[PDB]
């Protein structure tokens, strides 16, 4: 089945090969095209690996640790929420109701 798929996607004529029981029979020329494409595809696969590694590594640390990053927005907004609610009575009540469950 692996040969059936491989021969089916590489566009080779049915005059140029035969399927057997243990071996596949090929005309001359054909395995040169496969070796050249194998070299080319391996080079294309290696650039994909290097690109995924750069995907992982191109974490801009200004998007995880700088001034106007997600976290400092959370600190500024939650601290701004805290300054309002540290005065309100029903904020203060629920904080001492629940230690008494």
């Amino acid at each position: 089945k692996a040969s059936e798929k491989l021969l089916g996607s590489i566009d080779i004529d049915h005059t140029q090969y035969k399927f057997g029981h243990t071996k596949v029979f090929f005309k001359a020329g054909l395995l040169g095209t496969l070796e050249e494409m194998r070299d080319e595809k391996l080079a294309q696969l290696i650039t994909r690996t290097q690109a995924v590694c750069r995907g992982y590594l191109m974490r801009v640390e200004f998007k995880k640790m700088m001034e106007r990053r997600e976290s400092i927005f959370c600190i500024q907004y939650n601290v701004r929420a805290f300054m309002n609610v540290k005065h309100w009575p029903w904020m203060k009540l629920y904080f001492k109701i629940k230690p008494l469950l």
């Binding site: 391996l42 696969l45 994909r48 590594l57």
Partner: protein
């Protein structure tokens, strides 16, 4: 076309990269804006239809947000990027003895000497310490770490 949700996610990434406050990203950064959105573009993908300048080169061009939106859609979102199946059989070219193990020196050599060549600085930064005695590096564990 993109969703409103996709447009806002692409914008949230954009609003960090224009850090000078210009509403404009410097053209060099666009490949790493794409990496920041979880796509994995090759430098060959980056210099063609994404319109990037030379590597590590600033100043030459800048990109507005609305210009960035087809530069996500028609680029890495319009192609194959590779899967697990690619990497496993590409690594098996260098699996001499069939055990899922490749020498750390050979794996660093494939990253640094072949393809879109990695800096040694990049290679150490992506290395999770998985080197034994002369039991070397499990390459499947390496691929799963780099694709998580």
């Amino acid at each position: 076309e993109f969703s409103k949700e996709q447009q806002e996610d692409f914008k949230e990434a954009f609003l960090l990269f224009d850090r000078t406050g210009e509403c404009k990203i410097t053209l060099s950064q666009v490949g790493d804006v794409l990496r920041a959105l979880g796509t994995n573009p090759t430098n060959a993908e980056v210099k063609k239809v994404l319109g990037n300048p030379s590597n590590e080169e600033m100043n030459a061009k800048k990109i507005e947000f609305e210009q960035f939106l087809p530069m996500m859609q028609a680029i890495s979102n319009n192609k194959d990027q590779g899967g697990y199946e690619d990497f496993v059989e590409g690594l098996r070219v260098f699996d001499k003895e069939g055990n899922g193990t490749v020498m750390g020196a050979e794996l660093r050599h494939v990253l640094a000497t072949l393809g879109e060549k990695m800096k040694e600085e990049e290679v150490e930064a992506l290395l999770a310490g998985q080197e034994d005695s002369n039991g070397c590096i499990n390459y499947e564990a390496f691929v799963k770490h780099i694709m998580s």
